[PDB]
Symmetry: D2
Subunit: 481 residues, 4 copies
Amino acid sequence: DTMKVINDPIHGHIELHPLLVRIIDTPQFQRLRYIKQLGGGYYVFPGASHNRFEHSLGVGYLAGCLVHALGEKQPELQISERDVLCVQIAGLCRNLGHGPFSHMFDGRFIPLARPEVKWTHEQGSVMMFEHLINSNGIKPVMEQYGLIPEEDICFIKEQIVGPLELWPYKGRPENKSFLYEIVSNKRNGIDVDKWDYFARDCHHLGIQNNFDYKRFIKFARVCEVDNELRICARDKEVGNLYDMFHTRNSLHRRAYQHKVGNIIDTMITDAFLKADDYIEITGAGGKKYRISTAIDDMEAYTKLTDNIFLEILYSTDPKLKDAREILKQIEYRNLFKYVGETQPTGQIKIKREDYESLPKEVASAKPKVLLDVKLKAEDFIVDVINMDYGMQEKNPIDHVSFYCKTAPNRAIRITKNQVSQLLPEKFAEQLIRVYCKKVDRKSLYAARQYFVQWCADRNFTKPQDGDVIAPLITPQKKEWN
Amino acid sequence: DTMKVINDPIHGHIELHPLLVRIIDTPQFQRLRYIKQLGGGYYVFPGASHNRFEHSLGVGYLAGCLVHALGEKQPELQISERDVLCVQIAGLCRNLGHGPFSHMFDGRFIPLARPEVKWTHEQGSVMMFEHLINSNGIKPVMEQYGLIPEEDICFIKEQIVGPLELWPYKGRPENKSFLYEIVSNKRNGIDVDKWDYFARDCHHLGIQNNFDYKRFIKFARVCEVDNELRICARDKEVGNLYDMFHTRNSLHRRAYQHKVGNIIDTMITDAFLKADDYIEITGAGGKKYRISTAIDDMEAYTKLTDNIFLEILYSTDPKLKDAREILKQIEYRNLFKYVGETQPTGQIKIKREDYESLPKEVASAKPKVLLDVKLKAEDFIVDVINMDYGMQEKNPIDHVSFYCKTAPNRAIRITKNQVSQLLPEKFAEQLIRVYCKKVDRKSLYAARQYFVQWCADRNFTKPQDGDVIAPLITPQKKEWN
Amino acid sequence: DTMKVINDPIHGHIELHPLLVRIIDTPQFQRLRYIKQLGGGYYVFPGASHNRFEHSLGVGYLAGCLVHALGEKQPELQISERDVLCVQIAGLCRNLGHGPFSHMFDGRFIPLARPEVKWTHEQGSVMMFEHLINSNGIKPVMEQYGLIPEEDICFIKEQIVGPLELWPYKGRPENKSFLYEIVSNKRNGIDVDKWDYFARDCHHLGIQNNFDYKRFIKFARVCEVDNELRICARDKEVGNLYDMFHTRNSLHRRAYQHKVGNIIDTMITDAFLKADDYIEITGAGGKKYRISTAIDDMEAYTKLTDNIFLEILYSTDPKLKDAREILKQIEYRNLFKYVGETQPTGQIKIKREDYESLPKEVASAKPKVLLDVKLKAEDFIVDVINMDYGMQEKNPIDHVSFYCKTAPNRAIRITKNQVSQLLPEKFAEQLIRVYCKKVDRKSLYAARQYFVQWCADRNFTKPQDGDVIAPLITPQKKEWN
Amino acid sequence: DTMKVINDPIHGHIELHPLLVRIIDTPQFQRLRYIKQLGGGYYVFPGASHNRFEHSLGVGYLAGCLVHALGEKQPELQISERDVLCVQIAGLCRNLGHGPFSHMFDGRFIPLARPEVKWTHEQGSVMMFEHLINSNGIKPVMEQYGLIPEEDICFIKEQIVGPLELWPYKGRPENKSFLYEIVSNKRNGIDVDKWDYFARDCHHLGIQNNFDYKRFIKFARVCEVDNELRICARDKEVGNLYDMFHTRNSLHRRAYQHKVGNIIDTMITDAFLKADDYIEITGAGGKKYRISTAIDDMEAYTKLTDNIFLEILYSTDPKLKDAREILKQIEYRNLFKYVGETQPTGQIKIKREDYESLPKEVASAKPKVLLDVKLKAEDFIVDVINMDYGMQEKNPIDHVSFYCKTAPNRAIRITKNQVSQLLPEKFAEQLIRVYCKKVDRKSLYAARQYFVQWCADRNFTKPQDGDVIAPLITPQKKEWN
Ligand SMILES: Nc1nc2c(ncn2[C@H]2C[C@H](O)[C@@H](COP(=O)(O)OP(=O)(O)OP(=O)(O)O)O2)c(=O)[nH]1
Ligand SMILES: Nc1nc2c(ncn2[C@H]2C[C@H](O)[C@@H](COP(=O)(O)OP(=O)(O)OP(=O)(O)O)O2)c(=O)[nH]1
Ligand SMILES: Nc1nc2c(ncn2[C@H]2C[C@H](O)[C@@H](COP(=O)(O)OP(=O)(O)OP(=O)(O)O)O2)c(=O)[nH]1
Ligand SMILES: Nc1nc2c(ncn2[C@H]2C[C@H](O)[C@@H](COP(=O)(O)OP(=O)(O)OP(=O)(O)O)O2)c(=O)[nH]1
């Protein structure tokens, strides 16, 4: 068997080693063709038809580019072909755990369907990878190409999910620490997975990408930091690193958190929840699983993709009527109505436990306005979005090591003040979107009054259209004007 | 209510009139989200994840651009807002009739499943459009925005499929004949549908597009030709028009007729044929249809998309085992093996009626090579591809009218010699690909010997790799040496 | 005479009205072919070969696009063909006043050569425009196409330079106030000139542009604000508007203020100053002008372009030896050495009057570190860069009017807190770059010690490489540690 | 000294070895910043501001990419770092010999100014390279980095100009023959110089490029052919190779041979010829040269760039009045008028020696039409363009070697019949453009009559607009009708 070339619109011609091809040509990997990268986003950006499969190829490619570049510049690192292949495989396989409509599944559906369980796509990816290896006789192929399965499978999993539990890794030692910063960077989030989705999502969304990953690679080096060998960026690239996270935030703002994309994701999730008792997925030993329990059996999970949306949509069973009707309303674009957006002021943050109390709060507000209709808690959806630089409150650039041209082997730190006073002073905030399930004109008018009143009662920010949608309410709050 | 803006990666911001939005937001139109533009091509070019839905939006957009531009430059044409809307609707809806995996359905599956019927995507599009209008109460909406449904629905259908049967059209008169040249140009094939797929397919495939549709629009005018008002191009654009068809041929050669893309399409078609007795699709009156008969009932056809592939793949029914196994082999990349390509020589053309006799012919050849295995007719697939400039033998540029700068209202003709001696001497040819269903090394070696011998016996062209794959056969033919 | 089409890499096919063509085809306009958009930037980014001429065409094009879009959406504005042409002409002609190497001339050379005079490219553009009109018999042509020269020439000049001096404009009245916001927006800096250079500079520099001007145009409307009709943006676009200025800042940071591009601009300016007594430029009446005095006579200024660089470089006159030698050193890449960058802290701001005193201060600093060589004020260059959002300390978005979907004719305001807490807290800062004219290793080491000591003495920010370049000095300043 | 990174819009980040930087940072190399790649093309395509300098960097980059890829795939070739550097230097330096406005200088000016001499840019590049090496002490630097100047300078020159005059090369032996196929491919024209200008010219012109050089590199291998090791392409790439030449032809047709770009080049050449007696360029020993004789002294030639255009344009010397006036007319767009285009038929070919007789022939034609004015030989310009695939009549693909997947070390040939029947049947043709120096309406009408009559008299092809421009002449020729 020989290497294969794949033409990708983002990366051009990607060379795949025979071992990589063997891993790719399995039901577990090919499954990713049937899961949309941006889920409900496709229903707002028609270009975003792209799936997790092509993203995965790109991540594997870029992982190879970075590890190869480091090895070529610094032979002293002793990076090996075996190392390169393991990094590529991890890059290739770190999206294996995604479910129907990607983030919607891990972000919205599973938390509601199975609150007791803890689930992440990372854990899913490790489980799927194991299933892929075992179901397709990959281990023999790995030794054929010089890999040592026991150590290297461990190494690959560790790159995906982190320590499987002083040096916490078993797949490689401290001297090769930098290898763990390529595919999924737990230290500061600067990894090749972001680089591919920036470029790929932008290509499909029809929005341009400002981050130059090729430049980053060119300026990347490995230096000793606290007795570890780690990837360091050239000092002058610090502005570009801040911009990388800015680009991520802008993609979330324009696309991933689009108000309508989110509501479509919300509606699809509700449809899945209502279908969950009735859809069956056959797993290992012929046993039957549900959408919510397929995560327990990888054989079942292998067959859990975006297709479930169509299975529900095309169903005739009366048990599926409620779920089916929701999806049909999406098709007719009878969506829940966006009422508005606000943000908390000052120190105050909204806790995850409190999310459920929020619709009730909106319904409880007493706008001093005559209303034809009275709305109830159940008529409102409140979606809270945490926007940050990937490390909650923290500045990820405080967790980057740099080097300077006069001493390329000496790692240094750079503070925010040393860079620009125009940069963010905070690295996390919350957006609160409110929608109404009643779509009639009178209901929407009422919803706007409750919403703006709630904002005022809580001293949230004035909605941008507040003076238009609620001219009677906005005047009462002095701070607003 | 109001117009909507959609951001498209190819065209940027597309404005959709409220009437267009009403048509788009229906089950019949949204269905196109679930049908891949390039079908099996996605399995060779990972970027080609795009669906018929986004292509349809682009076609409607470009149809609007062209009709609008003509009206702005030539007020004397009396192009009306009603005309603009009807052209946009036709552009939007001319892909409604496509089936699962696009060309595979009309090009491969239906011809085999229903040889008696004559089916085209164009006919399908008209039927689906009628179903869309009737199922969603569109006619009242058309009247609201100034359309006259009887005349305008006729006009829209005519743009899609041609005369529904001296001026043959009923939707518009001879003085608006040019309007019929925008969405689906039956005169010479220069239409906005091609312009969108050139740009869109290129963007997703990762191959660059050489044709400038915007330039064409800028140089397009309407002139009187044989007592009809028709779209004419500036004389000087003739080279670019030849190049448009060159671009189309290159896209077919690189992508649409990719040997492996074609074989995947072939395998999927075989799977569908084997599943056809067992898959049920519920149509009007709760009644049940097959993949092959859903075309008879639009309610059933509405639910016939690429999902069928996954329904088969994920099935457990023993009756579907053979169909399911084919799709599973696609996943493992255990595909039928490409043996080679050849072409007829001289005046020889291969008739459609003779396609079935070809595998037998290959199996009947007697290569003077020792073979451990003997292959049979059923082990071979022979795929004949007709590559042309869209009008069989004819030069489409002979069916274009031009105008010159010194007399912009005077239509002229331009012959091929008046342009370049480097242009094609012929405008149609045939490519013949041979594959083998037995994938083992010995079988593939044998298949190569039969194939090259068959080529020699028929006086077809020497396969490009003939001296390598069949060194003992190739020497025999004098014409090849 | 008829309209002309120009193919532009940024905008595609641009249509130019015959009047515009007459203006373009003059020595005064064609001159812009010989002035680089980014001056010394070309010597760092080899792609940035582009000239002011093609930028000007793009600005004229976009000015037309915006005025046309507003008129089509809001017929009630009574925008006239005469208005459209005047806006296009202003867009076309607002770069006429640029001198050799663009910003370098107005930003560096003229302030040093002619400190008494107040010169701006805007003033230059008005003067050149007048010279263009008068020298080429344009006024008759304007009348031919329906313009009224007295009012319209005034209007065009006002768009370029602002009031020529309660409504301050004479070219158009308050009802057409929005027209003044297109070409050069004095209210908030959101104009089509920025939009072209973002796209064009990015195209040539090899840096991606993330601002979508076409989207902005689509969402732009005219609303009444304080008894003026002004351009308003859709409320939703506010994030994108903040990002427009972010993009501008990033282009300055990456490209326009590149440390080496700036030093090359500095060296070229020094060469021009040394050549100024000896280069002659023949103006009106055969009178001779200097590089520094050509601005006084437009006939002379017409012949003052980047050519002057080559005239000096290729000269043999002994008087030009010093100037010529500087340019020759640029060619050998024997440039002054970059020592580092710092910023003021707290309330501290560096005044224009204090710039020379800066080199002396650096030279005056006493490191406490032994040095082989002693450096003098004259050996240092200190370049102070004011980075802001175009309105000094002010937030330009506070000077934008918005509209909301529920009331598109009602102008509103949006504050920064209503948007994101991750946005800049400040909108202006200063960067201080230090270079050394002595390029030897010992001199450079000494320069680094003086520089970091100076930073510490002034309480400026710690240079990013401070611990590497000046390990002895960095510890002393507690604030840094 | 260390490697430098340059950001290029076409290639992104290009790494330059220190030796390459030393060569680049010389007056001889930096000169290329002041010569436009497409000469007069800039005056038709405003995007084409790019210069020979940035093209040269790209060619050096791609030369490195190809040689490095071959070495990585085939260690047995024994490609050395020394080899890589020499190939890069040749790629970098193969444009050193270009003169003002590029092709205009070698293609139009020198043939007229110095008919006795045989001059090519290739010869110029070798001379300039020698001058560069000797003037800047490069040989010691070459030795420092492991080059052997005697052998390697010879090798570099040979790559640029071919054998310096059975293996004809002295710089490398037959086992490294493939190295000579990278920078300037004398065998078939497939070289990295074309690849850069395709991409770069397209980027700037605003026309898309459809040739994928990266793909070509990926599929390139070295195989033994007639006792030489030569670069071979994968068999299936043959279509793409035909398309490479098609792309070249299309760029010539759309851009490089644009009728107006050519006439501007013609006018500039005439201006240079009229200025030649009076412009002085100071060369070695202070001696003076003319535009036409600067090619004799490299020190003078170093200072011969596009600036000559501006020196003439800005001159006041009465002796330069005639030359200056031509350039001023270009600025006013008072260009000679395009009359039309035709081609020879049958076997007819127009020799270089006969070009002079053509204007007289046109003037001699007797159209049987009444004319107000009589035109003379001197009023006509006849421009003959040879359009081919780079090898005159020959098919360059007949001079390409291929390999097949089954036997990657075995070189094969592929004939045109083996490929596509839609490909060109001829590989060379001539275009004849006629212009008139008299631009008045009566003169232009007369010119059209003479032109079409001449075409008929000679049995050339019917001009595309012939029936409009000469309705009384075209009916006469039966072949046309
Ligand atoms: N850019 C470009 N990409 C192509 C072209 N033809 C195919 N591709 C894409 C499709 C695949 O993603 C990738 C590899 O396709 P190939 O046809 O070279 O591989 P295939 O396995 O069919 O051929 P082989 O097994 O090597 O004979 O390149 C082309 O002409 N241009
Ligand atoms: N280029 C670009 N496209 C965007 C941005 N935000 C949204 N889009 C895309 C998504 C859709 O295809 C299209 C329209 O999205 P909008 O958010 O403007 O429409 P939506 O109906 O959500 O808002 P509206 O109903 O007007 O309040 O533009 C953006 O910031 N930049
Ligand atoms: N994209 C593209 N641009 C072209 C092509 N040919 C010329 N251009 C560019 C060059 C100019 O910037 C612009 C107009 O060129 P044209 O050749 O159409 O105008 P020209 O005045 O030479 O012809 P005309 O006076 O109309 O007979 O378009 C082409 O084939 N494709
Ligand atoms: N894409 C991109 N290119 C940049 C950026 N900054 C500079 N460049 C370009 C300009 C040059 O062509 C090339 C190298 O610029 P650098 O600033 O990295 O090199 P420089 O020699 O100025 O710094 P050094 O000597 O390494 O301290 O990259 C950036 O932020 N993004």
